[PDB]
Amino acid sequence: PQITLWQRPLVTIKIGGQLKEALLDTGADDTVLEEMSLPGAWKPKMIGGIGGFIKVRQYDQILIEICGHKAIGTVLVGPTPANIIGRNLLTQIGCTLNF
Amino acid sequence: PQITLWQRPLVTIKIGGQLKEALLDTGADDTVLEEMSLPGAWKPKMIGGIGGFIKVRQYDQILIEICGHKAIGTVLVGPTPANIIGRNLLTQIGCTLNF
Numbered sequence A, B: 001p002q003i004t005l006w007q008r009p010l011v012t013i014k015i016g017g018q019l020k021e022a023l024l025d026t027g028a029d030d031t032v033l034e035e036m037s038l039p040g041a042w043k044p045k046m047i048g049g050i051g052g053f054i055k056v057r058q059y060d061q062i063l064i065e066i067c068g069h070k071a072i073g074t075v076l077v078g079p080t081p082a083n084i085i086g087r088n089l090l091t092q093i094g095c096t097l098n099f
């Protein structure tokens, strides 16, 4: 679909068998989700944004379904104030910015 | 134009007579630019991001030209690690996410 921006671009994602809402975030290189249950191995990593950095857990090759599209990629888990779907995954579902 | 996301969505903006590059950021409610010279009055404000928060200066109704489109709106200036064009201005140039 086409999503205009007067409102936060929140979409429904299914990951690890759970349903969550997250922001389609063109300004994020990576995808970061609030503390959640994920299967597999994971290396600790650190990500930063406005305000500073957060310690997070990097899980590689996770399957995720965004607003209906599937993609596989890296998902970071941590105390993020908001679930963010970053470019690593937006490219996969073929998301583009248009004006 | 249409902008895909394999690379950071950096565009050229002209604001306060100066040229800068900034990120089209659907994940940002507001537009925050690095320490720069702006004319007019401004109230102090505080914004937060992934790693916490930053203190910035809020300037209202600033004219800005993004990748060729003009818009008027609020611009915050501060020690942001990156110039971000948020939804307040992206709506103005008619930007939409499409997949």
Ligand SMILES: CC(C)c1nc(CN(C)C(=O)N[C@H](C(=O)N[C@@H](Cc2ccccc2)C[C@H](O)[C@H](Cc2ccccc2)NC(=O)OCc2cncs2)C(C)C)cs1
Pocket (backbone or CB within 6 Å): A008, A025, A026, A027, A028, A029, A030, A031, A032, A047, A048, A049, A050, A080, A081, A082, A084, A086, B025, B026, B027, B028, B029, B030, B031, B032, B047, B048, B049, B050, B051, B080, B081, B082, B084, B086
């Ligand atoms: C509380 C919560 C439910 C929400 N609040 C808001 C409102 N807020 C605060 C914002 O929009 N705030 C913006 C912001 O930081 N947005 C963020 C999402 C977010 C929202 C709330 C809390 C934490 C993170 C999302 C933005 O795309 C920023 C922009 C950016 C890029 C480089 C350097 C600095 C900044 N990106 C990131 O923080 O990316 C982190 C990464 C992802 N992959 C790798 S690092 C500011 C720039 C204005 C939306 S959702």
